[PDB]
PDB file of all heavy atoms in Angstrom:
ATOM      1  N   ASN A   1     127.272  -0.190 169.410  1.00  0.00           N
ATOM      2  CA  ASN A   1     126.509  -0.617 170.555  1.00  0.00           C
ATOM      3  C   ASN A   1     124.907  -0.395 170.539  1.00  0.00           C
ATOM      4  O   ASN A   1     124.432  -0.090 171.497  1.00  0.00           O
ATOM      5  CB  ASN A   1     126.980   0.177 171.848  1.00  0.00           C
ATOM      6  CG  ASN A   1     126.364  -0.645 172.974  1.00  0.00           C
ATOM      7  OD1 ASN A   1     126.292  -1.759 173.196  1.00  0.00           O
ATOM      8  ND2 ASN A   1     125.854   0.340 173.959  1.00  0.00           N
ATOM      9  N   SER A   2     124.261  -0.868 169.243  1.00  0.00           N
ATOM     10  CA  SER A   2     122.856  -0.571 169.144  1.00  0.00           C
ATOM     11  C   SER A   2     122.264   0.542 169.784  1.00  0.00           C
ATOM     12  O   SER A   2     120.998   0.655 170.236  1.00  0.00           O
ATOM     13  CB  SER A   2     122.040  -1.828 169.438  1.00  0.00           C
ATOM     14  OG  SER A   2     122.553  -2.957 168.944  1.00  0.00           O
ATOM     15  N   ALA A   3     123.036   1.734 170.136  1.00  0.00           N
ATOM     16  CA  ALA A   3     122.586   2.875 170.663  1.00  0.00           C
ATOM     17  C   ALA A   3     122.112   3.811 169.814  1.00  0.00           C
ATOM     18  O   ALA A   3     122.252   5.052 169.880  1.00  0.00           O
ATOM     19  CB  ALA A   3     123.662   3.465 171.601  1.00  0.00           C
ATOM     20  N   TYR A   4     121.602   3.303 168.529  1.00  0.00           N
ATOM     21  CA  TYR A   4     121.204   4.172 167.400  1.00  0.00           C
ATOM     22  C   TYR A   4     119.856   3.680 166.820  1.00  0.00           C
ATOM     23  O   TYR A   4     119.603   2.447 166.848  1.00  0.00           O
ATOM     24  CB  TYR A   4     122.312   4.355 166.443  1.00  0.00           C
ATOM     25  CG  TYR A   4     123.478   4.855 167.069  1.00  0.00           C
ATOM     26  CD1 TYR A   4     124.574   4.031 167.475  1.00  0.00           C
ATOM     27  CD2 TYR A   4     123.677   6.329 167.182  1.00  0.00           C
ATOM     28  CE1 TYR A   4     125.602   4.611 167.998  1.00  0.00           C
ATOM     29  CE2 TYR A   4     124.852   6.863 167.770  1.00  0.00           C
ATOM     30  CZ  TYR A   4     125.977   5.929 168.183  1.00  0.00           C
ATOM     31  OH  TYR A   4     127.011   6.465 168.692  1.00  0.00           O
ATOM     32  N   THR A   5     119.131   4.589 166.276  1.00  0.00           N
ATOM     33  CA  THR A   5     118.066   4.221 165.228  1.00  0.00           C
ATOM     34  C   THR A   5     118.464   4.965 164.011  1.00  0.00           C
ATOM     35  O   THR A   5     119.273   5.795 164.060  1.00  0.00           O
ATOM     36  CB  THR A   5     116.796   4.708 165.925  1.00  0.00           C
ATOM     37  OG1 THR A   5     116.767   6.106 165.941  1.00  0.00           O
ATOM     38  CG2 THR A   5     116.544   4.156 167.319  1.00  0.00           C
ATOM     39  N   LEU A   6     117.588   4.685 162.945  1.00  0.00           N
ATOM     40  CA  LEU A   6     117.838   5.434 161.690  1.00  0.00           C
ATOM     41  C   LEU A   6     117.778   6.968 161.823  1.00  0.00           C
ATOM     42  O   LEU A   6     118.424   7.723 161.099  1.00  0.00           O
ATOM     43  CB  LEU A   6     116.773   5.086 160.726  1.00  0.00           C
ATOM     44  CG  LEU A   6     117.005   3.695 160.038  1.00  0.00           C
ATOM     45  CD1 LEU A   6     115.726   3.413 159.247  1.00  0.00           C
ATOM     46  CD2 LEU A   6     118.127   3.905 159.050  1.00  0.00           C
ATOM     47  N   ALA A   7     117.242   7.496 163.002  1.00  0.00           N
ATOM     48  CA  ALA A   7     117.276   8.863 163.222  1.00  0.00           C
ATOM     49  C   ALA A   7     118.708   9.484 163.277  1.00  0.00           C
ATOM     50  O   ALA A   7     119.034  10.417 162.575  1.00  0.00           O
ATOM     51  CB  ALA A   7     116.484   9.281 164.365  1.00  0.00           C
ATOM     52  N   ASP A   8     119.520   8.647 164.022  1.00  0.00           N
ATOM     53  CA  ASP A   8     120.877   9.062 164.310  1.00  0.00           C
ATOM     54  C   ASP A   8     121.743   8.901 163.052  1.00  0.00           C
ATOM     55  O   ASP A   8     123.032   8.867 163.227  1.00  0.00           O
ATOM     56  CB  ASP A   8     121.455   8.264 165.525  1.00  0.00           C
ATOM     57  CG  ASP A   8     120.469   8.155 166.556  1.00  0.00           C
ATOM     58  OD1 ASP A   8     119.644   9.027 166.966  1.00  0.00           O
ATOM     59  OD2 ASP A   8     120.316   6.999 167.049  1.00  0.00           O
ATOM     60  N   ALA A   9     121.257   8.651 161.862  1.00  0.00           N
ATOM     61  CA  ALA A   9     121.995   8.284 160.692  1.00  0.00           C
ATOM     62  C   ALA A   9     122.961   9.403 160.314  1.00  0.00           C
ATOM     63  O   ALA A   9     124.003   9.163 159.608  1.00  0.00           O
ATOM     64  CB  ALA A   9     121.082   7.913 159.542  1.00  0.00           C
ATOM     65  N   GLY A  10     122.664  10.627 160.679  1.00  0.00           N
ATOM     66  CA  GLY A  10     123.587  11.793 160.311  1.00  0.00           C
ATOM     67  C   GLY A  10     124.737  11.814 161.117  1.00  0.00           C
ATOM     68  O   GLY A  10     125.743  12.246 160.664  1.00  0.00           O
ATOM     69  N   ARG A  11     124.454  11.720 162.410  1.00  0.00           N
ATOM     70  CA  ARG A  11     125.536  11.656 163.468  1.00  0.00           C
ATOM     71  C   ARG A  11     126.605  10.540 162.967  1.00  0.00           C
ATOM     72  O   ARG A  11     127.785  10.728 163.178  1.00  0.00           O
ATOM     73  CB  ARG A  11     125.017  11.228 164.775  1.00  0.00           C
ATOM     74  CG  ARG A  11     126.004  11.197 165.915  1.00  0.00           C
ATOM     75  CD  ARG A  11     126.117  12.437 166.724  1.00  0.00           C
ATOM     76  NE  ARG A  11     127.110  12.349 167.864  1.00  0.00           N
ATOM     77  CZ  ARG A  11     128.172  13.233 167.844  1.00  0.00           C
ATOM     78  NH1 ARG A  11     128.305  14.125 166.948  1.00  0.00           N
ATOM     79  NH2 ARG A  11     128.948  13.000 168.910  1.00  0.00           N
ATOM     80  N   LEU A  12     126.175   9.441 162.334  1.00  0.00           N
ATOM     81  CA  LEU A  12     127.076   8.387 161.937  1.00  0.00           C
ATOM     82  C   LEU A  12     127.765   8.418 160.726  1.00  0.00           C
ATOM     83  O   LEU A  12     128.877   7.919 160.515  1.00  0.00           O
ATOM     84  CB  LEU A  12     126.232   6.934 162.024  1.00  0.00           C
ATOM     85  CG  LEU A  12     125.694   6.623 163.299  1.00  0.00           C
ATOM     86  CD1 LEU A  12     124.747   5.394 163.342  1.00  0.00           C
ATOM     87  CD2 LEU A  12     126.913   6.187 164.253  1.00  0.00           C
ATOM     88  N   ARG A  13     127.266   9.232 159.713  1.00  0.00           N
ATOM     89  CA  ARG A  13     127.987   9.580 158.479  1.00  0.00           C
ATOM     90  C   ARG A  13     129.214  10.431 158.787  1.00  0.00           C
ATOM     91  O   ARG A  13     130.156  10.531 158.051  1.00  0.00           O
ATOM     92  CB  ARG A  13     127.090  10.383 157.588  1.00  0.00           C
ATOM     93  CG  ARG A  13     127.696  10.385 156.106  1.00  0.00           C
ATOM     94  CD  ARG A  13     126.612  10.798 155.002  1.00  0.00           C
ATOM     95  NE  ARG A  13     126.793   9.935 153.917  1.00  0.00           N
ATOM     96  CZ  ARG A  13     127.514  10.216 152.771  1.00  0.00           C
ATOM     97  NH1 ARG A  13     128.086  11.563 152.592  1.00  0.00           N
ATOM     98  NH2 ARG A  13     127.605   9.399 151.934  1.00  0.00           N
ATOM     99  N   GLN A  14     129.339  11.060 159.984  1.00  0.00           N
ATOM    100  CA  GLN A  14     130.352  11.937 160.314  1.00  0.00           C
ATOM    101  C   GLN A  14     131.697  11.074 160.469  1.00  0.00           C
ATOM    102  O   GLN A  14     132.768  11.515 160.184  1.00  0.00           O
ATOM    103  CB  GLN A  14     130.080  12.781 161.686  1.00  0.00           C
ATOM    104  CG  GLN A  14     129.488  14.071 161.439  1.00  0.00           C
ATOM    105  CD  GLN A  14     128.487  14.509 162.587  1.00  0.00           C
ATOM    106  OE1 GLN A  14     127.375  14.965 162.402  1.00  0.00           O
ATOM    107  NE2 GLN A  14     128.895  14.187 163.856  1.00  0.00           N
ATOM    108  N   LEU A  15     131.460   9.826 160.848  1.00  0.00           N
ATOM    109  CA  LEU A  15     132.528   8.844 161.062  1.00  0.00           C
ATOM    110  C   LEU A  15     133.212   8.428 159.783  1.00  0.00           C
ATOM    111  O   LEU A  15     134.330   7.829 159.783  1.00  0.00           O
ATOM    112  CB  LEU A  15     131.980   7.567 161.831  1.00  0.00           C
ATOM    113  CG  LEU A  15     131.338   7.897 163.158  1.00  0.00           C
ATOM    114  CD1 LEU A  15     130.615   6.749 163.692  1.00  0.00           C
ATOM    115  CD2 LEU A  15     132.496   8.136 164.164  1.00  0.00           C
ATOM    116  N   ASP A  16     132.668   8.802 158.658  1.00  0.00           N
ATOM    117  CA  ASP A  16     133.061   8.356 157.341  1.00  0.00           C
ATOM    118  C   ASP A  16     134.561   8.682 156.879  1.00  0.00           C
ATOM    119  O   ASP A  16     135.114   7.897 156.213  1.00  0.00           O
ATOM    120  CB  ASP A  16     132.154   8.704 156.182  1.00  0.00           C
ATOM    121  CG  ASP A  16     130.895   7.859 156.073  1.00  0.00           C
ATOM    122  OD1 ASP A  16     130.564   7.084 157.036  1.00  0.00           O
ATOM    123  OD2 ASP A  16     130.289   7.848 154.967  1.00  0.00           O
ATOM    124  N   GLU A  17     134.790   9.934 157.188  1.00  0.00           N
ATOM    125  CA  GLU A  17     136.165  10.348 156.620  1.00  0.00           C
ATOM    126  C   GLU A  17     137.401   9.720 157.229  1.00  0.00           C
ATOM    127  O   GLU A  17     138.421   9.525 156.669  1.00  0.00           O
ATOM    128  CB  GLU A  17     136.338  12.010 156.854  1.00  0.00           C
ATOM    129  CG  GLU A  17     135.596  12.412 158.245  1.00  0.00           C
ATOM    130  CD  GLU A  17     135.922  13.874 158.480  1.00  0.00           C
ATOM    131  OE1 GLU A  17     136.707  14.461 157.775  1.00  0.00           O
ATOM    132  OE2 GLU A  17     135.383  14.456 159.467  1.00  0.00           O
ATOM    133  N   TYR A  18     137.142   9.071 158.526  1.00  0.00           N
ATOM    134  CA  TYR A  18     138.148   8.519 159.351  1.00  0.00           C
ATOM    135  C   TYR A  18     138.407   7.046 159.101  1.00  0.00           C
ATOM    136  O   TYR A  18     138.890   6.344 159.987  1.00  0.00           O
ATOM    137  CB  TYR A  18     137.892   8.676 160.669  1.00  0.00           C
ATOM    138  CG  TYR A  18     137.641  10.160 161.045  1.00  0.00           C
ATOM    139  CD1 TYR A  18     136.414  10.486 161.518  1.00  0.00           C
ATOM    140  CD2 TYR A  18     138.475  11.080 160.740  1.00  0.00           C
ATOM    141  CE1 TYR A  18     136.116  11.962 161.849  1.00  0.00           C
ATOM    142  CE2 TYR A  18     138.336  12.453 160.995  1.00  0.00           C
ATOM    143  CZ  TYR A  18     137.085  12.904 161.477  1.00  0.00           C
ATOM    144  OH  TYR A  18     136.820  14.188 161.696  1.00  0.00           O
ATOM    145  N   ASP A  19     138.333   6.700 157.734  1.00  0.00           N
ATOM    146  CA  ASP A  19     138.614   5.262 157.398  1.00  0.00           C
ATOM    147  C   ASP A  19     138.481   4.268 158.448  1.00  0.00           C
ATOM    148  O   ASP A  19     139.416   3.428 158.707  1.00  0.00           O
ATOM    149  CB  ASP A  19     139.873   5.014 156.587  1.00  0.00           C
ATOM    150  CG  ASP A  19     140.434   6.336 155.909  1.00  0.00           C
ATOM    151  OD1 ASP A  19     139.617   7.034 155.373  1.00  0.00           O
ATOM    152  OD2 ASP A  19     141.599   6.433 155.920  1.00  0.00           O
ATOM    153  N   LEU A  20     137.291   4.144 159.166  1.00  0.00           N
ATOM    154  CA  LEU A  20     136.918   3.022 159.860  1.00  0.00           C
ATOM    155  C   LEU A  20     136.740   1.714 158.984  1.00  0.00           C
ATOM    156  O   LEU A  20     136.233   1.887 157.853  1.00  0.00           O
ATOM    157  CB  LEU A  20     135.709   3.267 160.767  1.00  0.00           C
ATOM    158  CG  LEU A  20     135.753   4.391 161.749  1.00  0.00           C
ATOM    159  CD1 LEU A  20     134.449   4.586 162.376  1.00  0.00           C
ATOM    160  CD2 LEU A  20     136.871   4.159 162.775  1.00  0.00           C
ATOM    161  N   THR A  21     137.358   0.668 159.358  1.00  0.00           N
ATOM    162  CA  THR A  21     137.133  -0.571 158.817  1.00  0.00           C
ATOM    163  C   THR A  21     135.658  -0.915 158.752  1.00  0.00           C
ATOM    164  O   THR A  21     135.027  -1.381 157.770  1.00  0.00           O
ATOM    165  CB  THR A  21     137.860  -1.803 159.338  1.00  0.00           C
ATOM    166  OG1 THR A  21     139.181  -1.373 159.735  1.00  0.00           O
ATOM    167  CG2 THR A  21     137.953  -2.871 158.463  1.00  0.00           C
ATOM    168  N   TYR A  22     134.842  -0.521 159.800  1.00  0.00           N
ATOM    169  CA  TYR A  22     133.412  -0.768 159.899  1.00  0.00           C
ATOM    170  C   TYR A  22     132.865  -0.142 161.094  1.00  0.00           C
ATOM    171  O   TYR A  22     133.536   0.235 162.092  1.00  0.00           O
ATOM    172  CB  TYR A  22     133.114  -2.355 159.933  1.00  0.00           C
ATOM    173  CG  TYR A  22     133.989  -3.096 160.882  1.00  0.00           C
ATOM    174  CD1 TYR A  22     133.517  -3.188 162.248  1.00  0.00           C
ATOM    175  CD2 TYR A  22     135.062  -3.846 160.464  1.00  0.00           C
ATOM    176  CE1 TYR A  22     134.170  -3.908 163.195  1.00  0.00           C
ATOM    177  CE2 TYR A  22     135.783  -4.551 161.344  1.00  0.00           C
ATOM    178  CZ  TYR A  22     135.347  -4.630 162.665  1.00  0.00           C
ATOM    179  OH  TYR A  22     136.125  -5.314 163.599  1.00  0.00           O
ATOM    180  N   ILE A  23     131.515  -0.065 161.148  1.00  0.00           N
ATOM    181  CA  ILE A  23     130.757   0.406 162.346  1.00  0.00           C
ATOM    182  C   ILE A  23     129.994  -0.849 162.757  1.00  0.00           C
ATOM    183  O   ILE A  23     129.151  -1.332 161.983  1.00  0.00           O
ATOM    184  CB  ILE A  23     129.877   1.602 162.013  1.00  0.00           C
ATOM    185  CG1 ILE A  23     130.700   2.725 161.576  1.00  0.00           C
ATOM    186  CG2 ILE A  23     128.862   1.850 163.246  1.00  0.00           C
ATOM    187  CD1 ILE A  23     129.902   3.661 160.681  1.00  0.00           C
ATOM    188  N   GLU A  24     130.219  -1.406 164.000  1.00  0.00           N
ATOM    189  CA  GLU A  24     129.562  -2.637 164.376  1.00  0.00           C
ATOM    190  C   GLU A  24     128.132  -2.292 164.929  1.00  0.00           C
ATOM    191  O   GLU A  24     127.945  -1.538 165.937  1.00  0.00           O
ATOM    192  CB  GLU A  24     130.366  -3.308 165.417  1.00  0.00           C
ATOM    193  CG  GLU A  24     130.010  -4.697 165.595  1.00  0.00           C
ATOM    194  CD  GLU A  24     130.980  -5.490 166.457  1.00  0.00           C
ATOM    195  OE1 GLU A  24     132.084  -4.818 166.804  1.00  0.00           O
ATOM    196  OE2 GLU A  24     130.665  -6.560 167.018  1.00  0.00           O
ATOM    197  N   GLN A  25     127.173  -3.181 164.408  1.00  0.00           N
ATOM    198  CA  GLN A  25     125.726  -3.114 164.999  1.00  0.00           C
ATOM    199  C   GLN A  25     125.309  -1.809 165.446  1.00  0.00           C
ATOM    200  O   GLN A  25     125.048  -1.628 166.622  1.00  0.00           O
ATOM    201  CB  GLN A  25     125.650  -4.283 166.062  1.00  0.00           C
ATOM    202  CG  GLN A  25     124.174  -4.619 166.315  1.00  0.00           C
ATOM    203  CD  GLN A  25     123.661  -5.453 165.165  1.00  0.00           C
ATOM    204  OE1 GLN A  25     124.345  -6.257 164.582  1.00  0.00           O
ATOM    205  NE2 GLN A  25     122.442  -5.306 164.779  1.00  0.00           N
ATOM    206  N   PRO A  26     125.158  -0.720 164.519  1.00  0.00           N
ATOM    207  CA  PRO A  26     124.706   0.454 165.054  1.00  0.00           C
ATOM    208  C   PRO A  26     123.190   0.486 165.475  1.00  0.00           C
ATOM    209  O   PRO A  26     122.853   1.327 166.435  1.00  0.00           O
ATOM    210  CB  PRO A  26     124.906   1.376 163.774  1.00  0.00           C
ATOM    211  CG  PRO A  26     124.827   0.436 162.676  1.00  0.00           C
ATOM    212  CD  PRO A  26     125.471  -0.819 163.096  1.00  0.00           C
ATOM    213  N   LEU A  27     122.295  -0.255 164.826  1.00  0.00           N
ATOM    214  CA  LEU A  27     120.914  -0.207 165.150  1.00  0.00           C
ATOM    215  C   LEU A  27     120.473  -1.458 165.928  1.00  0.00           C
ATOM    216  O   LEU A  27     121.337  -2.160 166.463  1.00  0.00           O
ATOM    217  CB  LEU A  27     120.102  -0.065 163.930  1.00  0.00           C
ATOM    218  CG  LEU A  27     120.561   1.023 162.729  1.00  0.00           C
ATOM    219  CD1 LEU A  27     119.696   1.057 161.741  1.00  0.00           C
ATOM    220  CD2 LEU A  27     120.799   2.362 163.517  1.00  0.00           C
ATOM    221  N   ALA A  28     119.133  -1.634 166.031  1.00  0.00           N
ATOM    222  CA  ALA A  28     118.652  -2.706 167.040  1.00  0.00           C
ATOM    223  C   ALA A  28     119.319  -4.098 166.797  1.00  0.00           C
ATOM    224  O   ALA A  28     119.648  -4.454 165.589  1.00  0.00           O
ATOM    225  CB  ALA A  28     117.003  -2.787 166.764  1.00  0.00           C
ATOM    226  N   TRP A  29     119.461  -4.732 167.892  1.00  0.00           N
ATOM    227  CA  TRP A  29     120.115  -6.062 167.868  1.00  0.00           C
ATOM    228  C   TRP A  29     119.460  -7.174 167.046  1.00  0.00           C
ATOM    229  O   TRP A  29     120.259  -8.099 166.695  1.00  0.00           O
ATOM    230  CB  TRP A  29     120.259  -6.613 169.482  1.00  0.00           C
ATOM    231  CG  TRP A  29     118.857  -6.906 169.991  1.00  0.00           C
ATOM    232  CD1 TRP A  29     117.988  -6.056 170.593  1.00  0.00           C
ATOM    233  CD2 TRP A  29     118.220  -8.213 169.969  1.00  0.00           C
ATOM    234  NE1 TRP A  29     116.856  -6.737 171.010  1.00  0.00           N
ATOM    235  CE2 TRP A  29     116.975  -8.076 170.598  1.00  0.00           C
ATOM    236  CE3 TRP A  29     118.585  -9.423 169.445  1.00  0.00           C
ATOM    237  CZ2 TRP A  29     116.055  -9.098 170.880  1.00  0.00           C
ATOM    238  CZ3 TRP A  29     117.792 -10.518 169.758  1.00  0.00           C
ATOM    239  CH2 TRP A  29     116.465 -10.308 170.378  1.00  0.00           C
ATOM    240  N   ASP A  30     118.168  -7.124 166.815  1.00  0.00           N
ATOM    241  CA  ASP A  30     117.566  -7.952 166.026  1.00  0.00           C
ATOM    242  C   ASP A  30     117.155  -7.480 164.652  1.00  0.00           C
ATOM    243  O   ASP A  30     116.419  -8.312 163.884  1.00  0.00           O
ATOM    244  CB  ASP A  30     116.349  -8.619 166.848  1.00  0.00           C
ATOM    245  CG  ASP A  30     115.344  -7.545 167.199  1.00  0.00           C
ATOM    246  OD1 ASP A  30     115.640  -6.304 167.380  1.00  0.00           O
ATOM    247  OD2 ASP A  30     114.152  -7.805 167.614  1.00  0.00           O
ATOM    248  N   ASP A  31     117.760  -6.485 164.176  1.00  0.00           N
ATOM    249  CA  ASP A  31     117.518  -5.884 162.962  1.00  0.00           C
ATOM    250  C   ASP A  31     118.298  -6.264 161.777  1.00  0.00           C
ATOM    251  O   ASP A  31     119.536  -6.295 161.991  1.00  0.00           O
ATOM    252  CB  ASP A  31     117.354  -4.374 162.989  1.00  0.00           C
ATOM    253  CG  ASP A  31     117.165  -3.742 161.752  1.00  0.00           C
ATOM    254  OD1 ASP A  31     116.016  -3.663 161.254  1.00  0.00           O
ATOM    255  OD2 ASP A  31     118.123  -3.213 161.138  1.00  0.00           O
TER     256      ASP A  31
END
């Protein structure tokens, strides 16, 4: 939900172990 910027990148790597198929649009909507 674009509720992230590159700063939050560490928070988001935590999701990695849980075999998500994908993370949808983490950063800015136009980026």
Side-chain angles (χ1 to χ4, degrees):
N1 188 48
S2 312
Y4 303 96
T5 66
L6 278 167
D8 321 317
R11 184 94 182 117
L12 291 170
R13 193 165 222 263
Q14 273 151 220
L15 301 164
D16 273 26
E17 40 175 351
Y18 307 122
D19 332 323
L20 301 175
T21 321
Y22 51 84
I23 296 154
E24 195 174 348
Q25 200 72 38
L27 315 182
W29 65 274
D30 53 345
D31 174 79

